[PDB]
DNA sequence: GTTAGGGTTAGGGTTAGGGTTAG
DNA sequence: CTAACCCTAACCCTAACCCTAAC
């Protein structure tokens, strides 16, 4: 009935993924335990799947790599290669 | 910049009717080594999407009823 | 754990094991695992890795709709 | 120790949409 | 003004992985 939608990441969503990444690393299921639906801490990531979390973290890692900037510690173990 | 041939345009319309805005699938059928033709072999996936959107914006700008094979094609007027 | 794609040698060994003893993963490693009776072509794959590879094969067939080989009819796996 | 099955994740590939450009 | 283009961030597919429990 309409083109398939894409859902821009809000600032609250982005801040929640950064905190989850800094606490448990690239453990996407655990991050949603902390911040997903019925999350122990918050529910700010309740509208994102595990794969959505990983695709966003990868996009962040690619941004630092593309610009030559130092990787934040919480993105070192995130998947993503310049080529 | 390469203008679109009539055969290219017909192939894209055929792919959109069959698989909708599945750009990679359309090039499976009409792209390089396509299973049906090779009429779209010189167009990337983003080129296909951009051509279909070009078409959709033409209908939206003129009030003409949108063809069914463009409903799910991306494109909004300012 | 570092992920390692399956070579052709490993897949052929797993296929032959399924044909001979079915989804008896420990027995397949008796034939092709460490100190295997036939080869050591699967020496770097655990029993669970064999099960998971065979299930990935069965799932492909269930998705493609093409007929699955008989050596997969007893392999675990169902589209959801 | 064996194994079925549900759950998890890395990586390649795909695609919606805003913005730019050549004519 | 627009048909053709580029850049970005969001999205899908699946092969290879882990967890758990029944026996």
From Swiss-Prot, chain B:
Name the DNA-binding segment ranges.
Answer: 23-48
> Which domain of life, per UniProt?
Eukaryota
Where the record annotates domain HTH myb-type, the positions are 1-52
- Compartment(s): Nucleus; Chromosome, Telomere
Which purpose does this protein serve, as stated in its record? Binds the telomeric double-stranded TTAGGG repeat and negatively regulates telomere length. Involved in the regulation of gene expression. 52 binding sites have been identified, distributed over 15 chromosomes. A member of the general regulatory factors (GRFs) which act as genome partitioners. Acts as a chromatin insulator which are known as STARs (Subtelomeric anti-silencing region). STARs prevent negative or positive transcription influence by extending across chromatin to a promoter.
Extra facts: Present with 6380 molecules/cell in log phase SD medium.
Known partners and oligomeric status: Homodimer.
Q: What is this protein called?
A: Protein TBF1
Shown portion of the complete protein runs from: 409 to 486 of 562
């Amino acid at each position: 009935r309409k083109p398939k939608a894409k859902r821009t990441w809000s600032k609250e969503e982005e801040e929640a993924l950064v905190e989850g990444l800094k606490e448990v690393g690239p453990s996407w299921s655990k991050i949603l335990d902390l911040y997903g639906p019925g999350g122990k801490i918050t529910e700010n990531l309740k509208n994102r799947t595990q794969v959505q979390l990983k695709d966003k973290a990868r996009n962040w890692k690619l941004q630092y790599l593309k610009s030559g900037k130092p990787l934040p510690d919480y993105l070192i173990k995130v998947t993503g290669n310049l080529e």
